[PDB]
PDB file of C-alpha atoms and ligand atoms in Angstrom:
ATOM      1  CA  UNK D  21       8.453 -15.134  -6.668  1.00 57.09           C
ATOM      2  CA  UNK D  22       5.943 -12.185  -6.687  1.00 58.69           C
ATOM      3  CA  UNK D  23       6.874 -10.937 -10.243  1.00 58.60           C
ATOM      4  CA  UNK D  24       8.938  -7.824 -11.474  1.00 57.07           C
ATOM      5  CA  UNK D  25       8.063  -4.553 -12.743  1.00 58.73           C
ATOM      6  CA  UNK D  26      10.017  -1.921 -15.247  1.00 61.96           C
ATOM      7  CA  UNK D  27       9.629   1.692 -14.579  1.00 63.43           C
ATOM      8  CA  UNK D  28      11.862   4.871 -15.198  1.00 64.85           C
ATOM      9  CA  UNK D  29      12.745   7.949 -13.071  1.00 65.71           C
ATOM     10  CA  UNK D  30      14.317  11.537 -13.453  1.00 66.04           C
ATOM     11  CA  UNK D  31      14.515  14.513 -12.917  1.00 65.45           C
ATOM     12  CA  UNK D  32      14.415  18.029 -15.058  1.00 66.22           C
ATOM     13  CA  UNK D  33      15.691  20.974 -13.353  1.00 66.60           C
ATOM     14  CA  UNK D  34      14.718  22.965 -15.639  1.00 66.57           C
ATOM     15  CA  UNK D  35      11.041  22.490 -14.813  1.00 61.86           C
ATOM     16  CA  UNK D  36      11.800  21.070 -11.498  1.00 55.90           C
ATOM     17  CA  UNK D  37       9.673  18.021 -12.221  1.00 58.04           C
ATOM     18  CA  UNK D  38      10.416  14.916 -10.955  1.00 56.95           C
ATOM     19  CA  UNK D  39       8.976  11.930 -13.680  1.00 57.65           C
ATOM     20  CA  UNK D  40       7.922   8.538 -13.172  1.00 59.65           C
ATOM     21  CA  UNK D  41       6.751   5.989 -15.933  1.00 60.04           C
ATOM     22  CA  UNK D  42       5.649   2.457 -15.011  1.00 59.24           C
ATOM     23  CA  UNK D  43       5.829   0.919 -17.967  1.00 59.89           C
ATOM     24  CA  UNK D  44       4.893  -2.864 -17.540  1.00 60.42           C
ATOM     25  CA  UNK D  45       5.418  -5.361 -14.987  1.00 61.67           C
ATOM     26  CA  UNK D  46       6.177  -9.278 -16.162  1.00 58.61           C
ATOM     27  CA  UNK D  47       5.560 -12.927 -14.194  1.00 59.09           C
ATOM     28  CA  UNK D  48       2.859 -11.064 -11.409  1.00 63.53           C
ATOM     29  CA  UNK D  49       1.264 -13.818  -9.360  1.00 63.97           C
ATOM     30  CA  UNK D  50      -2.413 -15.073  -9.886  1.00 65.74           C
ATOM     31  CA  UNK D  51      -4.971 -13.870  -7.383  1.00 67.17           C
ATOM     32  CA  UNK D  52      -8.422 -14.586  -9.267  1.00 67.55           C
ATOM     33  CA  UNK D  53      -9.680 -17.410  -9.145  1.00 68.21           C
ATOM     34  CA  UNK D  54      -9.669 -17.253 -13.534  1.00 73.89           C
ATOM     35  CA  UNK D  55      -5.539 -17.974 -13.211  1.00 75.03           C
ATOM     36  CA  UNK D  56      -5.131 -14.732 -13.837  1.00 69.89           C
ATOM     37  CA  UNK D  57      -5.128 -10.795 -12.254  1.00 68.37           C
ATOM     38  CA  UNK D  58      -6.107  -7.191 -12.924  1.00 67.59           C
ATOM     39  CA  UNK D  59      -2.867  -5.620 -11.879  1.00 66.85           C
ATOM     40  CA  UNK D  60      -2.784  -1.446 -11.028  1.00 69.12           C
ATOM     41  CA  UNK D  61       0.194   0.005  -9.325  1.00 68.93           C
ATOM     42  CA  UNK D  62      -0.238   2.727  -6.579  1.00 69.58           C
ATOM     43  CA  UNK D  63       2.418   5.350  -6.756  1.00 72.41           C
ATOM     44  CA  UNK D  64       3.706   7.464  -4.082  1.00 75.08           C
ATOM     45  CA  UNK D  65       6.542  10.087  -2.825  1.00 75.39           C
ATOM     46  CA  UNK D  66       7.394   8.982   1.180  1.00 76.66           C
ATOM     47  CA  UNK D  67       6.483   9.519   3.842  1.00 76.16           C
ATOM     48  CA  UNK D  68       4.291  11.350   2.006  1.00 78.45           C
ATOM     49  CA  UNK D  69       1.191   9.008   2.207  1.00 78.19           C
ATOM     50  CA  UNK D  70      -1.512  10.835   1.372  1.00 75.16           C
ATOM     51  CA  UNK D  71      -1.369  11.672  -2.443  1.00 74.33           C
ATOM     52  CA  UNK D  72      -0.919   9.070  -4.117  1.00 76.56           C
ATOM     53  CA  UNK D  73      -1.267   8.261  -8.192  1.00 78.56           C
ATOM     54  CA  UNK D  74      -2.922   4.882  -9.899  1.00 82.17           C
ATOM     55  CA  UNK D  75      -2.117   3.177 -12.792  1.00 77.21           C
ATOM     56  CA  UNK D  76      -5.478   1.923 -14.564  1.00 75.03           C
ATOM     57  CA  UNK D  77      -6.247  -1.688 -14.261  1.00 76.74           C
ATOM     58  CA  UNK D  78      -5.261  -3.979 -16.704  1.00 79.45           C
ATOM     59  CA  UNK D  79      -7.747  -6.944 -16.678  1.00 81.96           C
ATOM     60  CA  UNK D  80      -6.468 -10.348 -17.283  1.00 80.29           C
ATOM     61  CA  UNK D  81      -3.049 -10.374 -17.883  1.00 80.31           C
ATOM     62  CA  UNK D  82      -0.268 -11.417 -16.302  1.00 79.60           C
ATOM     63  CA  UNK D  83       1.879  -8.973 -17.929  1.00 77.54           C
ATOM     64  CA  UNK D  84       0.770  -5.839 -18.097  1.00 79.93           C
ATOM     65  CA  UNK D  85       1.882  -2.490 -20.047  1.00 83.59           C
ATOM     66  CA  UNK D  86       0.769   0.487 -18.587  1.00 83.66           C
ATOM     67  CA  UNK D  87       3.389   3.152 -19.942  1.00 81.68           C
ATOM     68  CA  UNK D  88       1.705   5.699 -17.917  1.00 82.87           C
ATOM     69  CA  UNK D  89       3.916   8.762 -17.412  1.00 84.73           C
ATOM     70  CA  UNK D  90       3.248  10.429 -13.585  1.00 86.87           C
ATOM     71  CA  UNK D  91       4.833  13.943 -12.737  1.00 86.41           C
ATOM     72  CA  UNK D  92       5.729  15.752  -9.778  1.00 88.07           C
ATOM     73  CA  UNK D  93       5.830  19.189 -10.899  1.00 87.88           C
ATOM     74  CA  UNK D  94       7.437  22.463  -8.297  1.00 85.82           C
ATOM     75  CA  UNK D  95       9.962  19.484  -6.483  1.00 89.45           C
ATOM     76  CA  UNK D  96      13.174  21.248  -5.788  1.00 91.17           C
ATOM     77  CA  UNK D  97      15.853  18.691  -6.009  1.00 91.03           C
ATOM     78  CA  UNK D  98      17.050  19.009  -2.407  1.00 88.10           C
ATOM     79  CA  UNK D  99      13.917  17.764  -1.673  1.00 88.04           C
ATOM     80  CA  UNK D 100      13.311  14.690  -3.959  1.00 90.87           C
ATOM     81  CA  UNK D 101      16.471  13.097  -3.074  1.00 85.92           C
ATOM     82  CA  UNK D 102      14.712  12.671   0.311  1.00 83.28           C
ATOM     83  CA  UNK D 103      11.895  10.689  -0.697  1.00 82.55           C
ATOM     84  CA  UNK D 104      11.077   7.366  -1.491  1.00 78.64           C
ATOM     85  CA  UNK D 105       9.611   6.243  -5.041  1.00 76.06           C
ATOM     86  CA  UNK D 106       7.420   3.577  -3.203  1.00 78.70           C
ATOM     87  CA  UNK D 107       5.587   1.242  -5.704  1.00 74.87           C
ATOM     88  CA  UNK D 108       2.707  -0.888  -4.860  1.00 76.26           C
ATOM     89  CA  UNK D 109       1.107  -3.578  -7.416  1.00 73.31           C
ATOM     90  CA  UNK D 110      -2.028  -5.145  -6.567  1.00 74.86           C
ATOM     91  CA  UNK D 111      -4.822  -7.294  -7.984  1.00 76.72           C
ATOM     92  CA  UNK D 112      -8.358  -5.192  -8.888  1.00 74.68           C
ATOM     93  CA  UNK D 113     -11.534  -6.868  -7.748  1.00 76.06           C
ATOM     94  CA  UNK D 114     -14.724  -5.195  -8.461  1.00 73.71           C
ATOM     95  CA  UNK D 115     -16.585  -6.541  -5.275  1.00 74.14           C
ATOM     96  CA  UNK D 116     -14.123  -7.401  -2.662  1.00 75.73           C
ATOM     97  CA  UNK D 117     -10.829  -5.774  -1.380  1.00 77.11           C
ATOM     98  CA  UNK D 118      -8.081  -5.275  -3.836  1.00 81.35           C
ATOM     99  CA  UNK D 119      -5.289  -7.980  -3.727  1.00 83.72           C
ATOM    100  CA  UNK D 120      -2.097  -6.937  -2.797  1.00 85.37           C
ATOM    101  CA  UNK D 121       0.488  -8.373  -5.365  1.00 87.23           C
ATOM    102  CA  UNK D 122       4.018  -7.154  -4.575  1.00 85.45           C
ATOM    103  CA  UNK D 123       5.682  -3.857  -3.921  1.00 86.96           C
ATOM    104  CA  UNK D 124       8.657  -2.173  -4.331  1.00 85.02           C
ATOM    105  CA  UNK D 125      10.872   0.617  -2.987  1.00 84.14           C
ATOM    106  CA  UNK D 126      14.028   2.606  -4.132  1.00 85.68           C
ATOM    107  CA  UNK D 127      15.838   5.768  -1.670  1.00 83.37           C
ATOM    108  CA  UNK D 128      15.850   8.748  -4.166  1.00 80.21           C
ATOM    109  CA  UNK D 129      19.258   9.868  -2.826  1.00 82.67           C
ATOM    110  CA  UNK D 130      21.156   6.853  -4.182  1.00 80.07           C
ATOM    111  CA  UNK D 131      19.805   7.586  -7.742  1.00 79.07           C
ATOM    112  CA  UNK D 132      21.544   9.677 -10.590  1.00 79.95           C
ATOM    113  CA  UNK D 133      18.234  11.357 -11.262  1.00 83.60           C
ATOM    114  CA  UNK D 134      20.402  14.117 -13.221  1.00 83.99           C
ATOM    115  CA  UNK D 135      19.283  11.603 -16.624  1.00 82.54           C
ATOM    116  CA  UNK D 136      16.156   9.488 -17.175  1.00 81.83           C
ATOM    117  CA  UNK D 137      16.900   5.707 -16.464  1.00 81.10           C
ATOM    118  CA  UNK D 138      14.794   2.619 -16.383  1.00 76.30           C
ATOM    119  CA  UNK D 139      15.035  -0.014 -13.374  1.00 77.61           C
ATOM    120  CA  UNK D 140      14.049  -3.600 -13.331  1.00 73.72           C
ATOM    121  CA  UNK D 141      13.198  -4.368  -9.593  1.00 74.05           C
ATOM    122  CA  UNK D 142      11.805  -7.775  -8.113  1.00 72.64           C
ATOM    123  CA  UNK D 143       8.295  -7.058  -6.750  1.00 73.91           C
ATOM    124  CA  UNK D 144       8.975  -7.902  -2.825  1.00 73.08           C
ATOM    125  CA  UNK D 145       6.434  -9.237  -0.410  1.00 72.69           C
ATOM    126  CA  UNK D 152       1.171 -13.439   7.522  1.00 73.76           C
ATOM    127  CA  UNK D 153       0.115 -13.645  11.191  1.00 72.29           C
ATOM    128  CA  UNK D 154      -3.469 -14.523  10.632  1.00 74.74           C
ATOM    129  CA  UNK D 155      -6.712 -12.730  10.348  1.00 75.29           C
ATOM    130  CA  UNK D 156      -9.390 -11.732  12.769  1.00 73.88           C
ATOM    131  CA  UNK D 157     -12.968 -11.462  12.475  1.00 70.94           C
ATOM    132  CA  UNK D 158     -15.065  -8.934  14.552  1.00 71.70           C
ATOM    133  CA  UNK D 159     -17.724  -6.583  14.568  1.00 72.25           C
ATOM    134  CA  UNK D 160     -18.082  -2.175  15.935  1.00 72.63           C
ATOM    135  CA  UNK D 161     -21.339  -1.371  16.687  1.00 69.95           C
ATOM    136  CA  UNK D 162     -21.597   2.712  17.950  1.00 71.19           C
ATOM    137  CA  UNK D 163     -24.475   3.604  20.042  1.00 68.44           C
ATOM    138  CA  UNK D 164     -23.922   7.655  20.652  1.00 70.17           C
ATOM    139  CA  UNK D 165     -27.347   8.062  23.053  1.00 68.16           C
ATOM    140  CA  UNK D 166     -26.251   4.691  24.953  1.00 67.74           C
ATOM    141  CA  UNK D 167     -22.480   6.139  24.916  1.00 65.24           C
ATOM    142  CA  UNK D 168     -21.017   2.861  23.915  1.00 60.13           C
ATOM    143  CA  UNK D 169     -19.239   0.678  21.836  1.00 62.39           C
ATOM    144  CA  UNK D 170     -19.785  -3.069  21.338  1.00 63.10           C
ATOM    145  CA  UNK D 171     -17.155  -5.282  20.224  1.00 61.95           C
ATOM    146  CA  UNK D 172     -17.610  -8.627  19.084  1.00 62.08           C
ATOM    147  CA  UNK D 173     -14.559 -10.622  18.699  1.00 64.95           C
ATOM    148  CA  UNK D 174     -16.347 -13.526  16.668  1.00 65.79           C
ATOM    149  CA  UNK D 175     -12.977 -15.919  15.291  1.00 65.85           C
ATOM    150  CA  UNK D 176     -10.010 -15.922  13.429  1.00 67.49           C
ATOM    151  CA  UNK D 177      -8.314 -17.760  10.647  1.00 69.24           C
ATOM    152  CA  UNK D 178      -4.709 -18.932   9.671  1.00 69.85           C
ATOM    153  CA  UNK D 179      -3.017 -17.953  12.964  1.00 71.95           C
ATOM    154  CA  UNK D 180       0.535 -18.045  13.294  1.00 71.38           C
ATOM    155  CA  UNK D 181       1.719 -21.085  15.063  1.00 71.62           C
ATOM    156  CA  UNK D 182       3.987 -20.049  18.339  1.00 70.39           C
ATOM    157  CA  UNK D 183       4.234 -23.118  20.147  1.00 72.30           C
ATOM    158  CA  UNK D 184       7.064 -24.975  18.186  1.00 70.28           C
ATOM    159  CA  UNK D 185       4.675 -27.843  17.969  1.00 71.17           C
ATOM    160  CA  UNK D 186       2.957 -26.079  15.324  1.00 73.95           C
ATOM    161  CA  UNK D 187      -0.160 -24.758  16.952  1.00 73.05           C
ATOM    162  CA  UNK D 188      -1.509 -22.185  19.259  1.00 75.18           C
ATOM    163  CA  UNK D 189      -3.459 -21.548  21.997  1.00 75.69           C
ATOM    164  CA  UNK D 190      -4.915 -18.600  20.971  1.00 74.14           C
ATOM    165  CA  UNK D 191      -7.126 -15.823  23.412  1.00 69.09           C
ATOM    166  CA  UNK D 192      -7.742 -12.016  22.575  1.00 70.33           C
ATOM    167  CA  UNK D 193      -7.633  -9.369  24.671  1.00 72.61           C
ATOM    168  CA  UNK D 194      -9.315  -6.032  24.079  1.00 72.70           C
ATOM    169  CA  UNK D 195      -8.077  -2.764  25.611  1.00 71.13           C
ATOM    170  CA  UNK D 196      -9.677   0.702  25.622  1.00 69.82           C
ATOM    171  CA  UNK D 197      -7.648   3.570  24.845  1.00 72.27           C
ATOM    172  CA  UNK D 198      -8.098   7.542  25.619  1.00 72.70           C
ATOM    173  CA  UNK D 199      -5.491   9.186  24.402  1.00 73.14           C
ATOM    174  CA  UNK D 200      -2.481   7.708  25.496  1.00 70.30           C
ATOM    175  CA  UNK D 201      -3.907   6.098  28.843  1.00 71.16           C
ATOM    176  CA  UNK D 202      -4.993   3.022  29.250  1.00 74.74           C
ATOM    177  CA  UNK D 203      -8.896   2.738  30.193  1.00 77.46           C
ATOM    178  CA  UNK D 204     -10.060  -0.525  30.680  1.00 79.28           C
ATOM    179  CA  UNK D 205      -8.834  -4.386  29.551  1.00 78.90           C
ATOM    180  CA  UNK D 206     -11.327  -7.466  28.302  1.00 82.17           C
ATOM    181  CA  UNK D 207      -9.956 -10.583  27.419  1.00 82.45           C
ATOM    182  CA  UNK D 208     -11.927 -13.766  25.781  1.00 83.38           C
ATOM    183  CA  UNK D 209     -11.583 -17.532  27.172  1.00 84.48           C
ATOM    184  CA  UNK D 210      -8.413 -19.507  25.338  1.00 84.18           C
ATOM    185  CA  UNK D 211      -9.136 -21.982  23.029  1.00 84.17           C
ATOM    186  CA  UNK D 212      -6.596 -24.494  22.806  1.00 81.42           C
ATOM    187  CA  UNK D 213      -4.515 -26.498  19.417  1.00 77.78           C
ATOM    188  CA  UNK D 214      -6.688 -23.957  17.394  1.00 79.22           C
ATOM    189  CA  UNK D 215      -5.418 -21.919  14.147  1.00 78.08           C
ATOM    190  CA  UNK D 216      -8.845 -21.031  13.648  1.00 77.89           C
ATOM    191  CA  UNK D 217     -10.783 -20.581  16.389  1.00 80.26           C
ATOM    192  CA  UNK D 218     -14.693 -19.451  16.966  1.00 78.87           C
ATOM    193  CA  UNK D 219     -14.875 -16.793  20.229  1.00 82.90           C
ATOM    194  CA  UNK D 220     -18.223 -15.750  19.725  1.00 82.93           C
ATOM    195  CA  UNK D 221     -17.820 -12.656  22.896  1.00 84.72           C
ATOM    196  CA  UNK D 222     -19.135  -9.591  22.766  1.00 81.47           C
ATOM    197  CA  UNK D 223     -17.562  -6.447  25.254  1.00 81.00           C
ATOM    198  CA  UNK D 224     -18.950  -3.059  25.427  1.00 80.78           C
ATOM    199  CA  UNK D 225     -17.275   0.038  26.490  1.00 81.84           C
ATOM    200  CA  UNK D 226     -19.001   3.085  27.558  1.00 80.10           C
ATOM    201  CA  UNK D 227     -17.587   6.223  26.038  1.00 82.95           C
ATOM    202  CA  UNK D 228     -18.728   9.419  26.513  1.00 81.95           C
ATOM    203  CA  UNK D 229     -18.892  11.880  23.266  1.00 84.52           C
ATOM    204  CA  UNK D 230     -16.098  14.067  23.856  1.00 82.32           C
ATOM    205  CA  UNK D 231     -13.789  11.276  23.486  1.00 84.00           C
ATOM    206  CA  UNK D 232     -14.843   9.415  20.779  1.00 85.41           C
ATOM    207  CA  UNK D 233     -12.350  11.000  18.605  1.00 87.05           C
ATOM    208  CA  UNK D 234      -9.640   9.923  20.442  1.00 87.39           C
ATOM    209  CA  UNK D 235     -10.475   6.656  21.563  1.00 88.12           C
ATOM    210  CA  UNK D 236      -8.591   3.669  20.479  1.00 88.35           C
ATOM    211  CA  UNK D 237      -9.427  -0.197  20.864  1.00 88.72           C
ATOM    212  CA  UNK D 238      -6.123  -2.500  20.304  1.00 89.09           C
ATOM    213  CA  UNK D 239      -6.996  -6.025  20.166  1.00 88.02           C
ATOM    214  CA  UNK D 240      -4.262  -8.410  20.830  1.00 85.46           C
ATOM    215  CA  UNK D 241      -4.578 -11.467  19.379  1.00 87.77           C
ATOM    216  CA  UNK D 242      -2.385 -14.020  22.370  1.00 86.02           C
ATOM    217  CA  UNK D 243      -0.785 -17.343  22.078  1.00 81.04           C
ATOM    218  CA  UNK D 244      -1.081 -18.859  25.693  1.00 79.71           C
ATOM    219  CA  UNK D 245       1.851 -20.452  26.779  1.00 82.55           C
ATOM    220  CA  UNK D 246       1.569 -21.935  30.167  1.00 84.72           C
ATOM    221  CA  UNK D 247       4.752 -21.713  32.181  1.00 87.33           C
ATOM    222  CA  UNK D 248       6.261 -19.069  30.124  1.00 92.19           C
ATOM    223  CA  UNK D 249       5.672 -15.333  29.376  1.00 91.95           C
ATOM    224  CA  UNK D 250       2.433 -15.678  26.741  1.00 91.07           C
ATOM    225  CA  UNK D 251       3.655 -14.947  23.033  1.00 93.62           C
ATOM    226  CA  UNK D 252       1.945 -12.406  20.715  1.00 93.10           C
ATOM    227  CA  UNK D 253       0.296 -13.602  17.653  1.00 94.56           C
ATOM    228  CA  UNK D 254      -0.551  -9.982  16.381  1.00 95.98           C
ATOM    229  CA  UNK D 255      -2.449  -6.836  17.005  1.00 94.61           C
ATOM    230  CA  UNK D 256      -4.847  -4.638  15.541  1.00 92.34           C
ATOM    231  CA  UNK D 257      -5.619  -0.645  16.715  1.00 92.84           C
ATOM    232  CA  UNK D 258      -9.060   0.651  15.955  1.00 91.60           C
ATOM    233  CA  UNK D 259      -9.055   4.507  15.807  1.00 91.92           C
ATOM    234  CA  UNK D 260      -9.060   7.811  13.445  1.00 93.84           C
ATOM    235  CA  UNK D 261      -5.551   6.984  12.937  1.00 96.15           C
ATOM    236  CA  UNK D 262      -4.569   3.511  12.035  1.00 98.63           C
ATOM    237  CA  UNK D 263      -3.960   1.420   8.859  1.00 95.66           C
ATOM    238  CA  UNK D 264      -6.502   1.928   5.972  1.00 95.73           C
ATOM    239  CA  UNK D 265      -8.574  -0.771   6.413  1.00 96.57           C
ATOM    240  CA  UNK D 266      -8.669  -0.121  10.223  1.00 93.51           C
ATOM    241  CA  UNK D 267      -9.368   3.864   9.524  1.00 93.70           C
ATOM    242  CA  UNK D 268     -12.227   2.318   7.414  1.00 94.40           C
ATOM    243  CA  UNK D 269     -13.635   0.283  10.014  1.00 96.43           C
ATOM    244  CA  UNK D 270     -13.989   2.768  12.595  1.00 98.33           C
ATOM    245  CA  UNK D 271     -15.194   5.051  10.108  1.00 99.89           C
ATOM    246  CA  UNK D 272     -18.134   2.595   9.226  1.00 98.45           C
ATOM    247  CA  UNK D 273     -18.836   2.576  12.907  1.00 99.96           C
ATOM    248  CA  UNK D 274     -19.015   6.205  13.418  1.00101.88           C
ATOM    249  CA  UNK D 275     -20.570   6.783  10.120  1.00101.83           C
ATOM    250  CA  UNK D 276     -23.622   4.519  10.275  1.00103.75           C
ATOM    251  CA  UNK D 277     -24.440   4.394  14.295  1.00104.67           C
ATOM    252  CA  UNK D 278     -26.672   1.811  15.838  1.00103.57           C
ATOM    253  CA  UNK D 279     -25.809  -0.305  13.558  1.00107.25           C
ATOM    254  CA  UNK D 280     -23.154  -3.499  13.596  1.00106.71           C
ATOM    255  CA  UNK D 281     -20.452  -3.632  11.193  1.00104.64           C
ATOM    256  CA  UNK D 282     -18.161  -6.528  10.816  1.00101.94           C
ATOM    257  CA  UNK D 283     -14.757  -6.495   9.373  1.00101.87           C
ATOM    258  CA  UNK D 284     -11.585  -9.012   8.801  1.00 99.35           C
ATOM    259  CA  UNK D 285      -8.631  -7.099   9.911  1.00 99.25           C
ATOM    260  CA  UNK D 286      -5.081  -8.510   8.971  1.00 99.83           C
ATOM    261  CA  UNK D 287      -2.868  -8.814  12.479  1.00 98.55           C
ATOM    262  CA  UNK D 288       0.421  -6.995  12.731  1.00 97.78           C
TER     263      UNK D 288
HETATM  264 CA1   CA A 301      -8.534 -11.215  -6.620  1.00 95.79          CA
HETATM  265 CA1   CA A 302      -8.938  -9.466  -9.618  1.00 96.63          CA
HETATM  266 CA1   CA A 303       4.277 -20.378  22.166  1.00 95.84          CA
HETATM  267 CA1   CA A 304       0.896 -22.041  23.712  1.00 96.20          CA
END
C-alpha cells in the first residue's frame, strides 16, 4: 500500500545505549509530480516528542538506503522498554510542506532488545482541508479570522455530500468566550465562505487563547454531524503551532494557512 521499511534495534547495557539503524525502505508511494519521492524518516522515542532525529533525504528514488545508525546514549533499560520507536517516512519538497509517506510504530516492551535484530514493518497510513487566514492586531487588541473555503470534505450525508458550515469559538483557558458561525452552503465538498470574524483580546491573554474551528455537516432533522476540527493556539499540532506563531510573530499582518481537519 504505502511501502515498507527495514530498520534494526538494541540495546547495550554495557553502555546503556539504546541503537537504531534505518537502513532502507522499498515500494514508498510517489508524491512528486516526477513519479517519484525524496524520502527522509523522522525518528523518535514516545511520548517523547520533542527530540527527534532525521534521516537525510534521498532524492528520487523509490527505494532508498539510508543505513544511518541513531543512538540513545545514558537510557537505563527500565526506561526504554517504555517507549515507543515511532518511525515517520515522508516525501522532501524544497518549497512546499513535506509529504507525509507512511509511518510506523513498535512498543519497546514487547522487543528482545537484549540482541540487535532487524524488522521489516509495512509503512501504515482524510476529512478535508480548510483554508483561512490570522491576522494579530496587538494596539487594536484583536484577532481577525477569515474562514475563506475548504476542499475534499468528508461526505456525512449517506448520499455522498455535505452541507457544510464552520463555526468559530474563542477560547481563554479552558472557558468558553464567544461562538461565530458562517452561513451553510449546501451539496458542497468544496465550498467558498469568504467571512471574516474578529475577536477582541486583550494582551494578557494572548498566550492562552485558543480558536477551534469546527468544520459542520448540517443535517436538518437530526443532531448536525462533525466533519472535523482544528485548534489554533501555543499548543496544538505543528502546523497549527506554526500558524499561530506566524500570527504572533509578524503582527498587522494577514497570514493564510491550509490546516488538515481532525
Ligand atoms: Ca511532494
Ligand atoms: Ca518531493
Ligand atoms: Ca449527515
Ligand atoms: Ca447534511
Amino acid at each position: 500500500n504505502l511501502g515498507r521499511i527495514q530498520f534494526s534495534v538494541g540495546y547495550n547495557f554495557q553502555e546503556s545505549t539504546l541503537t537504531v539503524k534505518v537502513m532502507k525502505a522499498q515500494e514508498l508511494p510517489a508524491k512528486d509530480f516526477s513519479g517519484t519521492s525524496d524520502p527522509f524518516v523522522k525518528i523518535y522515542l514516545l511520548p517523547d516528542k520533542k527530540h527527534k532525529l532525521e534521516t537525510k533525504v534521498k532524492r528520487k528514488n523509490l527505494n532508498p538506503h539510508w543505513n544511518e545508525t541513531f543512538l540513545f546514549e545514558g537510557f537505563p533499560y527500565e526506561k526504554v522498554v517504555q517507549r515507543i520507536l515511532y518511525l515517520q517516512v515522508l516525501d522532501y519538497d524544497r518549497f512546499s510542506r513535506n509529504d507525509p509517506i507512511g509511518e510506523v510504530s513498535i512498543p519497546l516492551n514487547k522487543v528482545d532488545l537484549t540482541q540487535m535484530q532487524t524488522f521489516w514493518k509495512d509503512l501504515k497510513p482524510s476529512r478535508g482541508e480548510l483554508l483561512l487566514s490570522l491576522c494579530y492586531n496587538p494596539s487594536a487588541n484583536s484577532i481577525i479570522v477569515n474562514i475563506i473555503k475548504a476542499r475534499n470534505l468528508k461526505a456525512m450525508d449517506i448520499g455522498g455530500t455535505s452541507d457544510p458550515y464552520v463555526k468559530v469559538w474563542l477560547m481563554y483557558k479552558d472557558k468558553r468566550v464567544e461562538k461565530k458561525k458562517t452561513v451553510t452552503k449546501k451539496r458542497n465538498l468544496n465550498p467558498i465562505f469568504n467571512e471574516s470574524f474578529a475577536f477582541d483580546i486583550p494582551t494578557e491573554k494572548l498566550r492562552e487563547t485558543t480558536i477551534i474551528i469546527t468544520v459542520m455537516d448540517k443535517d436538518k432533522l437530526s443532531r448536525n454531524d462533525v466533519i472535523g476540527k482544528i485548534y489554533l493556539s501555543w499548543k496544538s499540532g505543528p502546523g497549527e503551532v506554526k500558524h499561530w506563531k506566524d500570527m504572533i510573530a509578524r503582527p498587522r499582518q494577514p497570514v493564510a494557512q491550509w490546516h488538515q481537519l481532525k
